Design an enzyme around this catalytic site. Structure first.
Site, PDB file in Angstrom:
ATOM      1  N   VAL A   1     -14.919 -10.826 -12.237  1.00 65.77           N
ATOM      2  CA  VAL A   1     -16.274 -10.643 -11.763  1.00 65.77           C
ATOM      3  C   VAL A   1     -15.941 -10.594 -10.267  1.00 65.77           C
ATOM      4  O   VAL A   1     -15.453 -11.554  -9.692  1.00 65.77           O
ATOM      5  CB  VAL A   1     -17.214 -11.809 -12.015  1.00 65.77           C
ATOM      6  N   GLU A   2     -16.091  -9.443  -9.628  1.00 68.83           N
ATOM      7  CA  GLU A   2     -15.731  -9.304  -8.233  1.00 68.83           C
ATOM      8  C   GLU A   2     -16.985  -9.297  -7.379  1.00 68.83           C
ATOM      9  O   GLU A   2     -17.912  -8.533  -7.613  1.00 68.83           O
ATOM     10  CB  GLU A   2     -15.005  -7.967  -8.068  1.00 68.83           C
ATOM     11  N   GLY A   3     -16.983 -10.153  -6.368  1.00 69.21           N
ATOM     12  CA  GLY A   3     -18.104 -10.339  -5.460  1.00 69.21           C
ATOM     13  C   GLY A   3     -18.884 -11.547  -5.971  1.00 69.21           C
ATOM     14  O   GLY A   3     -19.840 -11.412  -6.754  1.00 69.21           O
TER      15      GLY A   3
ATOM     16  N   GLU B   1      -6.830  -2.703  -5.440  1.00 69.07           N
ATOM     17  CA  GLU B   1      -8.273  -2.822  -5.605  1.00 69.07           C
ATOM     18  C   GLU B   1      -8.777  -1.437  -6.027  1.00 69.07           C
ATOM     19  O   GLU B   1      -9.579  -1.330  -6.945  1.00 69.07           O
ATOM     20  CB  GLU B   1      -8.924  -3.210  -4.271  1.00 69.07           C
TER      21      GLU B   1
END
Ligand SMILES: [C][N][C][C][C][N][C][C][C][N][C][C][C]([O])N1=C2C(=O)[N]C(=O)N=C2N([C][C]([O])[C]([O])[C]([O])[C]OP([O])(=O)OP([O])(=O)O[C][C]2O[C](N3[C]=NC4=C3N=[C]N=C4[N])[C]([O])[C]2[O])C2=[C]C([C])=C([C])[C]=C21
Ligand SMILES: [C][N][C][C][C][N][C][C][C][N][C][C][C]([O])N1=C2C(=O)[N]C(=O)N=C2N([C][C]([O])[C]([O])[C]([O])[C]OP([O])(=O)OP([O])(=O)O[C][C]2O[C](N3[C]=NC4=C3N=[C]N=C4[N])[C]([O])[C]2[O])C2=[C]C([C])=C([C])[C]=C21
Ligand SMILES: *[C@@H]1O[C@H](CO)[C@@H](O[C@@H]2O[C@H](CO)[C@@H](O)[C@H](O)[C@H]2NC(C)=O)[C@H](O)[C@H]1NC(C)=O
Ligand code: NAG
Lengths: 462, 459
Positions: free
Chosen positions: B57-59, B166
């Site tokens: 879960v990025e951010g 990324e």
């Protein structure tokens, strides 16, 4: 008007020639190395002189005459041979031995060419501002309907041979609009002639120079005091009234104007300090353009073990790793007594290889050669030459490449003068960036801009 | 109105859900594979389920709440862990044995980060039209005054871990303006949480689907006839009056609209024929954007031979060949005692590797690890899993990446409808292309556009 010309490569010698022609003869040409010629420079390898830099007159037999061609083929009679790529399909080696089926390769080559042809039609329509540009790769995807460009070993080495071997960076980074089609070929013709003369392709530059600089009657060496070698410019201060230039040995020279012909790589490196500092728009233009690297690795062997004959000059290695020792050339015509091969690499591989020993590179290549020629007894190269242009502070690469992301106006900013400081060199050639003829013509153009301001008091640029 | 949704990945499920909430319940979701979730997909490897696709879960922890987060961390409580990259400087291996001096590496990392920070400042000043855009690499040259970006093995692997890891493509192909800084982190926070739960990150999708699709009261399986697996759309015909969609098994369905959620790589491939062909502008916008590939190579070993402890989760291999098996992760927390390592590759290496056997890839990887840990007796991995997303016709890659040359307008065209043909998916996300929350919000956005046009005749 006194003019200082920084660098005695093709464009600085060409620019000075034109200024002289306009009667601007109070010139001082400061060259960093102990010789002129710049990126056109030969070296002894194995008993013969081979070219470390430019090797072909590219763009011959078309509608317009490439200005370099007559010099080479007529005036100096530099020995040269038309390169023929027609037999490539019979010469593509499998990663693990032998060549692929000719018809199979021919089909892959024709497919790749037709994609490029459709690419030329799209390119013609793009907005002149360069704002709708895209990479050659994006065009390849569009045209074959795939989420990738050439991706199998054979198609990748054909792609590498079509594009990287010309531009020195991959299609995905290269501007479509500015390279397909390419003006050099549209204007001058599709052929390319490889120069292989002991005097060196650089003889062209000596010729031009001798047209206006005094030379010694017996030796013909240039002895004009207007040319000063071993003078590395490290600072250029310029003001409304004039310019002052300093060299590393501390010499200081003054003039009404300066003409900078150092490579884009040199300008990117900060070797020359400007005072005041160049404007931001100019600095950005400089860093946005690409300075590529093209490494010509020559190898000498105690015996021949590769094919010679019709269509054998050029051959490819289809590695599963893109650009890995892929483009080969053998010199049965150019250097018949020799036993030399030339494998060309660029970009990422060039930086990696310049950073390691020539021996380590020789060993990687021998592994590739043994795989290509498993039926032969492949002896180790007894000599290898790895040019290191990116590491040389006076060049920092081999030639510019127009990247996707540089628009028409940004490219004009790269050439634009700043006060009394003018720029010239291959990276300032409107339509022939990256070539000897592009350097040659950029010299005349830059000079003329300067002539206008100095003689016709017309100093506003664009 | 009747609407056919092509694909049951995150965006399809999410779009079908928003439509449902608007009252548009006559839906038909056609999914190519035998399951929903698409790019959020788990698999058993060495007796544990690892994620073949999205894993983080990025951010998280930022100014706004990443919508995926509460679902993961509060609703479903999927097991997860914050990734900490602070110790990277102690874990960068030399091509031929041992780690580099930590202080040296830490300074190279700071230099890299500082250059990127300057790029963020630059980026902020670029014209909105995109006319001044440039690649991240060009920004690197400008910011350090050199003719090249990172070029020593160490600088290159740091560069790779900062960007390719990324974006899945190098900085020289990536749009500075559109990636630095990145909205996902600027809006939602700098942290990332690795999901390591046996139910799978895909549980998020199953939970969403379950809010409106029917499921068996025992089973809990979705049994709604509106969801049809194993349906591979091969053709979509449309007219000003409706659309017809044909599947590989020969079924034919008809509806008022169609919502295409297949990946950008699928769209770049011709698996689905549009009749009539999509307009030239649409087709151009499609081929211009990039569909990147990120391959998660998992390996199982009879025993551990690598470090474990504080800061050891992530480590880099600084090969002189850029991107060669360079980013590693060990799972002491996630999968205790499993002896599994994960090396990640992308782009060129991903395509080469998908085209060779697992055994060949395993052998290459063993040479590397032996070089990294010369002081150890390194056992051969006993199992290896090489995902092949690029080769898979239903994906043709892992997530989009914004290339230099594409501006906001051409990107927006990617999302634009063509008549009654609507598009959704991560590559249509206004500000979060490439992510799970991006696919999520894209589904809702695409659905609302169709809703306004279909229901309010405000198109
Ligand atoms: C169609 N079909 C086709 C087939 C294909 N083929 C392939 C092959 C091709 N490839 C590409 C290219 C190459 O090869 N090369 C070449 C050729 O061949 N040709 C041509 O044309 N070209 C080329 N190149 C490029 C050239 O060389 C260039 O451009 C020129 O030369 C440039 O000139 P300029 O601009 O003038 O510059 P330079 O030279 O650099 O000069 C400058 C000078 O300066 C000096 N300095 C510096 N700094 C300084 C100074 N001084 C003072 N101070 C200071 N600071 C220097 O020193 C000089 O002198 C090429 C190149 C190369 C390198 C290579 C390798 C290759 C090539
Ligand atoms: C600051 N610090 C930071 C550090 C860094 N680290 C690094 C890490 C990161 N990397 C990158 C990313 C990755 O990892 N991943 C991920 C994650 O983790 N996360 C997120 O968020 N994301 C991600 N990813 C992405 C995602 O996954 C995506 O975006 C999504 O999921 C997508 O969704 P959509 O759009 O919905 O799509 P899909 O799923 O595909 O779905 C669709 C559908 O459809 C179908 N089809 C097709 N075709 C067809 C169909 N149907 C019918 N018919 C036809 N024809 C399909 O099947 C589906 O279901 C990611 C991903 C991946 C893959 C990987 C490997 C990774 C990742
Ligand atoms: C390169 O230079 C040679 C040198 O002359 C050209 O060959 C001469 O061409 C004139 C033109 O008809 C003839 O009268 C000579 O007989 C030719 N000489 C030889 C030795 O054949 C040649 O065509 C030039 N090549 C190119 C591509 O321009
Ligand atoms: C995640 O959820 C747990 C469960 O209540 C909570 O203790 C923790 O602070 C949460 N972390 C974040 C980043 O929200």
């Amino acid at each position: 008007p006194r003019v200082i010309v920084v660098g005695a490569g093709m464009s600085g010698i060409s620019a000075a020639k034109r200024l002289s022609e306009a009667g601007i003869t109070d010139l001082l040409i400061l060259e960093a190395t102990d010789h002129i010629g710049g990126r056109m420079h030969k070296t002894n390898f194995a008993g013969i002189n081979v070219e470390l830099g430019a090797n072909w007159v590219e763009g011959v037999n078309g509608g317009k005459m490439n200005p370099i061609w007559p010099i080479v083929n007529s005036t100096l009679k530099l020995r040269n041979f038309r390169s023929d790529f027609d037999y490539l399909a019979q010469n593509v080696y499998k990663e693990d031995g032998g060549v692929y089926d000719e018809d199979y390769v021919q089909k892959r080559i024709e497919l790749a060419d037709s994609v490029e042809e459709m690419g030329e039609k799209l390119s013609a329509t793009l907005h002149a501002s360069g704002r709708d540009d895209m990479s050659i790769l994006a065009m390849q995807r569009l045209n074959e309907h795939q989420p990738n460009g050439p991706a199998t070993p054979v198609d990748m080495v054909v792609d590498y041979y079509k594009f990287d071997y010309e531009f020195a960076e991959p299609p995905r980074v290269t501007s479509l609009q500015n390279t397909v089609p390419l003006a050099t070929f549209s204007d001058f013709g599709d052929d390319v002639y490889f120069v292989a003369d002991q005097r060196g392709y650089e003889a062209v530059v000596y010729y031009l120079a001798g047209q206006y600089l005094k030379t010694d009657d017996k030796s013909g060496k240039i002895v004009d005091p207007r040319l000063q070698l071993n003078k590395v410019v490290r600072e250029i201060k310029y003001s409304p009234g004039g310019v002052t230039v300093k060299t590393e040995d501390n010499s200081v020279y003054s003039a009404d104007y300066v003409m900078v012909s150092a490579s884009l790589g040199v300008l990117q490196s900060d070797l020359i300090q400007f005072k005041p500092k160049l404007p931001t728009w100019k600095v950005r233009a400089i860093y946005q353009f690409d300075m590529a690297v093209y490494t010509k690795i020559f190898l000498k062997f105690p015996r021949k073990f590769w094919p010679e004959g019709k269509g054998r000059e050029f051959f490819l290695y289809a590695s599963s790793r893109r650009g890995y020792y892929g483009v080969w050339q053998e010199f049965e015509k150019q250097y018949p007594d020799a036993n030399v091969l030339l494998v060309t690499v660029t970009d990422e591989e060039s930086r990696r290889i310049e950073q390691q020993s020539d021996e380590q590179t020789k060993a990687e290549i021998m592994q590739v050669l043994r795989k290509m020629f498993p039926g032969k007894d492949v002896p180790d190269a007894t000599d290898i030459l790895v040019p290191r242009w990116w590491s040389d502070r006076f060049y920092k690469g081999t030639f510019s490449n127009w990247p996707v992301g540089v628009n028409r106006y940004e490219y004009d900013q790269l050439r634009a003068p700043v006060g009394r400081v003018y720029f010239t060199g291959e990276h300032t050639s409107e339509h022939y960036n990256g070539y000897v003829h592009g350097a040659y013509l950029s010299g005349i153009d830059s000079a003329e801009i300067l002539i206008n301001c100095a003689q016709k008091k017309m100093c506003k640029y664009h």
